Amino acid sequence: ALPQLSDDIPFRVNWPGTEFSLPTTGVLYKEDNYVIMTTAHKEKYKCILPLVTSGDEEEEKDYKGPNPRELLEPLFKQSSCSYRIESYWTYEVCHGKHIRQYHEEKETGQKINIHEYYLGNMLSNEIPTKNIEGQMTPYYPVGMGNGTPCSLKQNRPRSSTVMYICHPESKHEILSVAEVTTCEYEVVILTPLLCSHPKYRFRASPVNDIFCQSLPGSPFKPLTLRQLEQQEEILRVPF
Amino acid sequence: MFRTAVMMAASLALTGAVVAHAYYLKHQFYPTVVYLTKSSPSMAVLYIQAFVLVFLLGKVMGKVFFGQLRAAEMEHLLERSWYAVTETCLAFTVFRDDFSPRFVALFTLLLFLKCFHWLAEDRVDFMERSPNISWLFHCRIVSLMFLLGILDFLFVSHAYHSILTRGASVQLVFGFEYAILMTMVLTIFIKYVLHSVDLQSENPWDNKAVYMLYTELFTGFIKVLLYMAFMTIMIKVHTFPLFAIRPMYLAMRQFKKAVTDAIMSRR
Amino acid sequence: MFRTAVMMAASLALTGAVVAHAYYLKHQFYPTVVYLTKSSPSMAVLYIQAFVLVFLLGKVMGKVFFGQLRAAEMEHLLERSWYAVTETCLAFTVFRDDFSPRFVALFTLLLFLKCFHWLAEDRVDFMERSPNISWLFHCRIVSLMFLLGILDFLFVSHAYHSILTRGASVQLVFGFEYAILMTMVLTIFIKYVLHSVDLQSENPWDNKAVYMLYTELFTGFIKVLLYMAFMTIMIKVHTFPLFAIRPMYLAMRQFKKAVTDAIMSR
Amino acid sequence: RRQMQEAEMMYQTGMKILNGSNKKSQKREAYRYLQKAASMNHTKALERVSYALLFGDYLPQNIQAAREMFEKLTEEGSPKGQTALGFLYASGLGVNSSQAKALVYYTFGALGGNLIAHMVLGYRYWAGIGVLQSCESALTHYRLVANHVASDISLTGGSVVQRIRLPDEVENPGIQYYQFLAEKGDVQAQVGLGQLHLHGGRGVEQNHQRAFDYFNLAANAGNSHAMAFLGKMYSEGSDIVPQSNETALHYFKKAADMGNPVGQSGLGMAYLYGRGVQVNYDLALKYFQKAAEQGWVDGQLQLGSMYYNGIGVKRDYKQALKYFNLASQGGHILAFYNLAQMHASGTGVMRSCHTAVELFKNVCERGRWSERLMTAYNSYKDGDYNAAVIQYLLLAEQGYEVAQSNAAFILDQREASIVGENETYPRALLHWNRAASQGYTVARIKLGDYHFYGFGTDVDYETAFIHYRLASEQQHSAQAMFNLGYMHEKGLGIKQDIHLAKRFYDMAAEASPDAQVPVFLALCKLGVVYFLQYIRE
């Protein structure tokens, strides 16, 4: 297939050996989908290839935890909220209270004024998803309006939406700020507090692992690979 | 007019043969227009279509102001057009401002007004020699001077503001030429006002010769001052003056004749 | 004549003052020459003095060749010089061959040759339009035409050698102008031969008009071929042509009218 | 058995002709002997000619007998027959394009010892192409390649090949006179031609003998660069120029005395390595200090290796990394390799995966396989589009960024007929997608165009808007915000707003001098629509 099987489907070469049983759950395997492979050291191996299914949602989704807003309560109560610096402007979102955008006016060490512009004051069984860089990713929305009034939109207040996207290596930082329409905003927040939710978690394609069984007579795993794994464990742990 | 029609249609099939060539290599808006303004064979035809749509525009704007040429303005304009085209190309490359869309359009816009101002001057001289003057011809002559006067001051002030904005550049030379054409429109309007004053009176105007001689004396000193200061400014500039040369000599020769005529009249 | 003498004296005084200023801080002749070559005002004064001397020499040559001004050929030559100075300045600026004194003298010589050719054509037309002719004027015209043809041939050969040895430069345009001058000189020689043949008989020559039309048609064809070759060379050249432009239209208008006149005559 | 002796003799008769003559006719007659041994099932001949059949290089291209000779090579257990069958199963050239099968062939190619299956697996683990993205899997496979490249062809070999992009060459196009100028006695022209003959490049083949005569002509002229280069030729040695320290070091000592930066590096290196002279650690560091001060590429990396290994100077890894990071910006492979060996090991700099793998990627991308960029480029100019995309699809597989765009460019213009018309747009989107995620801007705009027009995908205005935005906020292409303005005035994939369209229009004006014209006609059309709205009011 074109759109999903382009290059997004992970494969893993595993060596279970001559005495191995093909798994009956998850991906589908056929005995006629196979290649016979021989190493340079005349070690004959049989690799059983998997039929790429990678489909459905039969992951047994059982979530008895709290709501997504419960995890964001510690983020809002901490009041240690992120900044973002651009070419000229600087939006500053603050979690649950206000959103601000400004650039401080500076003369030759003289001016101390500010371009003051508010963004908004925070005075369904399907979770919405946002295409982040072309890849679908779920999120939790929260809206906040009544900011500084929009001059170009019939003196209507500025409205903003805050988007939380799970990222285990992030530290509650602003990913990117854009505009849908004028004086209408969205901000994607990468924070790891709500990563515990299975639906909000980072979606991973299932690994279509490959069983390269040992044809009877050959060792369990090729010799040059075994010497390769030995050097890498040597190179890694001192490092 | 039909000979101009075959010039227009064969030109519009050359502009559309270089645009449609570029929407074959780069199939969108942005990579086409960027390609058209970089390759010089493609940029040449668009310049040809600009002038073919300027002379045709000039042939239209020359119909509102004047009904037709009087078989001597065309001979007079073409003689001055050869000098003006040579002078305009002389000042462009010497100033090292490069052949740019901002520089070529500004320079050719001066010659569009200069030829229109020169055609009215021959009509102004023919106004005194034509006893039959209608109401519509007087209004059109008044209309051309008003548009010439406003555009001359607008181009003078914008270029003078550009002198304070940037400094010594090619805009000072073009602004200086517009200032010389600014007094040309005022002198033409003065001659039109003087002739219309003599037109209303059914008697010989003895003071017409004195007013005409003083008008040229005012024009001669203004042209000399605008050229002497320009020559001194270009003397202390990066490049030599060059450029007009002959127009200053033509103004000086006319001023010397006007000065000698006033001395003969006074004595 | 008094104004020309006063202007020449003023130019000589200015040149002497410039020479004294040059040899007032540089005692050595080589340092003085280097300072004069490196000074813009001294170079401008030298160019003005050279232009004044060239104008005096041209006036002397015109007085030697032609007896007096015809009061219309002088105005035609003034208009031709006014056009030619601007054309030479435009050609020098457009070609980007750098401002040097080695080409200004050649440009002045080419302008003087063009003015002499125009004056010779005007003199031939006046002789055809006048019934009284002296043998001294005919001999002077023949000598001037021979000298102009020899100079044009030498300049054309030198320009052709320079183009074949060096490459593409303003020497190609100079050679094209020299070839145009040589074609004009050949046409003027044919016209003068026809006029001498017609003036020898005390009757109107009916075939003089046909011979003149044939000569004009041949000259127009040669001029059209030269203009097409020059335009092709400019198109194949990296720089924009600019330059004369107007002389090409005048040759085309004369050739088209003569061909229409010849077709109407035939 | 008698066939095996004849086939091996037939292979060596062609292998001798292949190495000694660089003529296209002579190389193809070398392969006329290799092809004869291929019919006799000579093993090492089957590797050489099946790659020649597949790439359309030195033989007429035919994938079907290339693939058939690969399957004969796989059952024997070849490392180079298992790798290129993986390239077929990954790109679907004669096969049904199964990425599951291509990983099995690549993994057995890398175990066999091949350094193309080690680059490809090191790039698939690095970009997550067919496998899980992983550092430590992509670091072990990019090291064994970089260990080979740095040890073998560092300067003992050396392949400085230009990486020319076809899409950039279209947007802005890029020897006899230089040879004639050097024939007139110009020392600079001879040194420039000598550098283009000893090292090669710019479409000029290498000529060691011609470079020796050209350098000696400029050596008599007294050029400082030629004096060191003449000493370097005598030092390193070749067939034409014998290797000898004694005469070479004396000339380098004379060059280092007066003004030569190239002479200073060689004179210090001869003293440092003890090539014909006594080892002087203090003199070498002092001599190479001015080589670093003058800006020599090979001198800055030479001083750092003395401090990183602690030979002569104290083991100041802060000073050692100072030299290697300075030489890396000058374009030295040994600076890239030694920098990456410090990051990966954790000495001097913190133990960082990601900085090591992008530094191991640049040393790997300058090996003996990188000259196939020129062979793919020359086959593009000569109208062989079937044999210019195959040599560009292998290097696209290996991880090159120029070859992931040149392969995608050839597949975009429908020129290459080896792939069907019914497959070429998904196959060109695949390599536009790979090149866009490697910091290339045209591939990010062209990723937007394919989703804008439905070129191999369903037409998706929302995804096209994202790729146009991603080419604006990071790479700042002027066309990326001009195209962003059009989607905002027309409401394609986003809610229409004219005010944002002007914002994104004049953003192109300040981002490039080429956008002044096409934003003028686009802002005026925007203004006329604005004039049209107020009329209907």
Ligand SMILES: *[C@@H]1O[C@H](CO)[C@@H](O)[C@H](O[C@@H]2O[C@H](CO)[C@@H](O[C@H]3O[C@H](CO[C@H]4O[C@H](CO[C@H]5O[C@H](CO)[C@@H](O)[C@H](O)[C@@H]5O)[C@@H](O)[C@H](O[C@@H]5O[C@H](CO)[C@@H](O)[C@H](O)[C@@H]5O)[C@@H]4O)[C@@H](O[C@@H]4O[C@H](CO)[C@@H](O)[C@H](O)[C@@H]4O)[C@H](O)[C@@H]3O)[C@H](O)[C@H]2NC(C)=O)[C@H]1NC(C)=O
């Ligand atoms: C180098 O230096 C910096 C950083 O190193 C670079 O970023 C800079 O590039 C540009 O440089 C200029 C000069 O410093 C930057 O300042 C300019 O912006 C001023 C502020 O205006 C901006 O924001 C307003 C706000 O509009 C709405 O914004 C949102 C809705 O989208 C609302 O939340 C908010 O409340 C407002 O309602 C924009 O309107 C404005 O955009 C402007 O509008 C037109 C359409 O009419 C757009 O086409 C243009 O984009 C235009 O800029 C800006 O985004 C601006 O000054 C204003 O106007 C007068 C002129 O200065 C001032 O007198 C006023 O006081 C007012 O401040 C003006 O554009 C400044 O020049 C600029 O932002 C920056 N980058 C860009 C292009 O955005 C580099 N250049 C230099 C040397 O600084």
Ligand SMILES: *[C@@H]1O[C@H](CO)[C@@H](O)[C@H](O)[C@H]1NC(C)=O
């Ligand atoms: C070995 O060589 C023979 C040549 O006779 C040819 O059939 C083929 O290349 C090989 N034979 C096999 C693979 O059975």
Ligand SMILES: *[C@@H]1O[C@H](CO)[C@@H](O)[C@H](O)[C@H]1NC(C)=O
């Ligand atoms: C693979 O491609 C070959 C090409 O001829 C075809 O015969 C074969 O059936 C294909 N295998 C599939 C589609 O499983």
Ligand SMILES: *[C@@H]1O[C@H](CO)[C@@H](O)[C@H](O)[C@H]1NC(C)=O
């Ligand atoms: C330099 O001399 C040493 C012995 O002193 C020798 O081993 C080495 O090969 C010489 N260098 C070269 C390039 O031959």
Ligand SMILES: *[C@@H]1O[C@H](CO)[C@@H](O)[C@H](O)[C@H]1NC(C)=O
């Ligand atoms: C191949 O192309 C045809 C039309 O030429 C069309 O059916 C479709 O695009 C493709 N079909 C298959 C089965 O690949």
